[PDB]
Write a protein that binds this ligand. Structure first.
Ligand code: QGX
Ligand code: QGX
Ligand code: CL
Ligand code: CL
Lengths: 298, 301
């Protein structure tokens, strides 16, 4: 029993965190094979011209107490790739994946190439992440673990004026309409990740918290008209299908749970809580709920 | 900026998780140097669950009864002994991934990261606090026994908890790494209930300071209170009393924000009286009590 916000074990990623220094800027880098990936803003803007002026010896890369020899450098979008003379002996099986809004991932927050914390978060529909980051965390990565394969999905780049965070996939492409330049940028109005709220209600039913269940069902169209009104993301037929296994396990059809959600929005919680929370949680995907309520290991 | 429930990186602990099997029972073990620590109830049969005599059961066991598996390598158990409710299995190989470590016993209110494991394999990492009733509100399934709670001291891992059992309410009970249970719990199938849980008041105040550091000020007020008047209001809401030690521990946060402890205490009193009025603090509609003053300082500085 129990339901916690749970991150993937960070070991496989910790063995990849290195410190990257260029001039007065020190941030984190991801050492995979003989390549170190880090935000291109470490050279700081005309990034192509700035990188042309740089030499391999300008980049100081440190892995623990060993300095790595940079033997090449190139740029892929907003990420800098530093070729090094040594393959990371702790390189896990990995992939670079681009995630969608709603999908969750674990973040390994680092400072000076040293992992300090691991937390689970979701890529918000407005493409920001509500992370916890201080100065020096740039280069910290977001990942998922698929069987025994690390899927790198995020690299931290900056903090927006509201305190939310922005970053890129491991190919340097930003998530959202953000740029890595000191200019006024605002996150769009965020919305709630509806499929994740439904997944979290299933997790509550699995844990015995069932006060919110009602006799009602709804059509997907009627649910979406009501959800749109409360700044909730539309629920697609893909989401209904993904919630299938949880619907079968709990005996609560997706449209049946949608009518529970529909009432929770129009009426509130009435002083009651669900999984120790007075708000509807939207940072647990249907896969996270299944994984946590079935004990999948890594 | 931002405030998240943040666990310590679990790598140093993952390299210590092994699978321990004795008869039909399979749970997790912690491999440190040439010793594997695991809950002693792994040696229990079906009949010996309500009132097991662990000394008597362990005397009947031989080293060849314990199957220890570290990855795809079976470890040779060359000795066995019991320290309180923990079984110590000596093995013929020192764990090459043994980190710098200490065995620490924690107090209610203290937080720690939990590495949930199944069959000696880490599946998840989450943050926990030792509840005032000495239980932990974890997320555990059958097979999670032996999963450990830890904190990281720069390079050193302080092991503070080993999961043993789930109480009837769904909350969890366990021991320090010396086998001593936290709370009035025993590793027997006898009827056991957790006492009424209370809110870790000092942790709530630490969390309100974290909110002020993050720019949340709506809950602040012009009032101050005496420590005695705050404690009388707090107990009525099932909140732990706040001692002079807690006021002193909140000192650095009070200096950083410019809000005295008794000033924040009056804000907490007002919050308990009115509720949140549809507003949130750090994205939460409830007062969070699983961030210690030490966690808040660490995460904000
Ligand atoms: N120095 C960073 C930055 O703001 N990175 C930080 C990350 N997370 C949290 C931070 C909190 C405080 C200060 C800095 C933070 C930066 C600044 C401007 C731009 Cl346009 C870019 Cl791409 C990157
Ligand atoms: N079978 C275990 C147990 O309850 N261990 C589990 C741990 N966490 C969560 C669990 C959820 C479901 C089933 C089992 C769980 C057990 C039972 C009685 C006693 Cl007295 C002891 Cl020491 C240990
Ligand atoms: Cl699924
Ligand atoms: Cl008193």
């Amino acid at each position: 029993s129990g339901f916690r916000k749970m991150a993937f074990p960070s070991g496989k990623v910790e063995g990849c965190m290195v410190q990257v220094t260029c001039g007065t800027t020190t941030l984190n880098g991801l050492w995979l094979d003989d390549v170190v990936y880090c935000p291109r803003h470490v050279i700081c803007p005309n990034y192509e011209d700035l990188l042309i002026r740089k030499s391999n010896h300008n980049f100081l890369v440190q892995a623990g107490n060993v300095q790595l020899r940079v033997i090449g450098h190139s740029m892929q979008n907003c990420v800098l790739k530093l070729k090094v003379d040594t393959a990371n002996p702790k390189t896990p099986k990995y992939k670079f994946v681009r995630i969608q809004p709603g999908q969750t991932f674990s973040v390994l927050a680092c400072y000076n190439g040293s992992p300090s914390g691991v937390y689970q978060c979701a890529m918000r529909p407005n493409f920001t992440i509500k992370g916890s980051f201080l100065n020096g965390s740039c280069g910290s990565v977001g990942f998922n673990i698929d069987y025994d394969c690390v899927s790198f999905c995020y690299m931290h780049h900056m903090e927006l004026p509201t305190g939310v965070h922005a970053g890129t996939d491991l190919e340097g492409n930003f998530y959202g309409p953000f740029v890595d330049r000191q200019t006024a940028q605002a996150a769009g109005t965020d919305t709630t990740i509806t499929v994740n709220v439904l997944a979290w209600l299933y997790a509550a039913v699995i844990n015995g918290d069932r006060w919110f269940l009602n006799r009602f069902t709804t059509t997907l169209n009627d649910f979406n008209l009501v959800a749109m009104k409360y700044n909730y993301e539309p629920l697609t037929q893909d989401h209904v299908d993904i919630l299938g296994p949880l619907s079968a396990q709990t005996g609560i059809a997706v449209l049946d749970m949608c009518a529970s959600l529909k009432e929770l929005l129009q009426n509130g919680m009435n002083g009651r809580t669900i999984l120790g929370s007075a708000l509807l949680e939207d940072e647990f995907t249907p896969f996270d709920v299944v994984r946590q309520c079935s004990g999948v290991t890594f």
